[PDB]
Amino acid sequence: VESSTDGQVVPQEVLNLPLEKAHEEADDYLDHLLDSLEELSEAHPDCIPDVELSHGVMTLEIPAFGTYVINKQPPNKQIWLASPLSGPNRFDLLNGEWVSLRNGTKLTDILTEEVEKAISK
């Protein structure tokens, strides 16, 4: 912070508030997904045995197709999908939902399709 400034704001009532860092919107998504997908992991006739979430990396075992990988990524566009079925994709917010850079389809919809394509068989 080289400007030789002596003191900007400290206009306390920013700093005397119940203050809080933001939460990566990608981080937010992966949580709403971890326990929404492990609440699906209940009604598997057998065939979605595991979801695990590391450090912004999510693995999803689905033996019917092979194993999904879902990632926090540096931009150029963020959130990464590696699907054993539909291939690789990446996603950024448009209007509150996560959308493919490729064609602009929701990954929320791509998971739905592919998860319930599995409940069938």
Added chain:
Amino acid sequence: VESSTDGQVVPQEVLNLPLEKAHEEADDYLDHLLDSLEELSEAHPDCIPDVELSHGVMTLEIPAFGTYVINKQPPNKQIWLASPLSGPNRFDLLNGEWVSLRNGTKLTDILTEEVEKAISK
């Protein structure tokens, strides 16, 4: 730069031009805002006493509501708004203007609304 290359371009007439780094488009915005909002800071019946701009952090005192914070942020989407009234938001360029990732509304419009919501009282 490990490619063992000996010399690419130096096609001078890029380098013999009146040359210049770009300016962060967020940086550009915060300036057009600092002196547009301190030219509003004149016609306050009392109630917007201070704007200060550090190092891509802007504070705006508005005692009616509490204190605004406006930030340069690493992407996932850039420019950050912490409003004492409307809450937190983040914004990226769409077509030359700065737009909310949440719903795509202009922050240019959100400030307008909230600044002049204040001139009233």
Added chain:
Amino acid sequence: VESSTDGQVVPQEVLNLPLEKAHEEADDYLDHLLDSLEELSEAHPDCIPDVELSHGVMTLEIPAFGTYVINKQPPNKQIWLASPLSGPNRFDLLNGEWVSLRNGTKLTDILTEEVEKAISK
């Protein structure tokens, strides 16, 4: 990776697959451009003598106008165009194509226009 975790996935059949890092979509573009623009560099009546590509920096000599520079850039929006004719611009993916943050026009189209504006004279 400080969580004291002992072992997440290793669900091999991610790791026993023919695996592969992704390729920057900007990197992809600059290649499809290097050899598409050096296949134009053939039918120059004289006037586009050189294209060179370093490390995600591309130079394009076009003596009629002066020299183009095309860059891989950290986001806030990515891929950078410095045109001797149309000025500076930056571009992000929308739906699989590279689009100006300023007004949303394709750079693919901006090069076309300016390259063939040159074949003429």
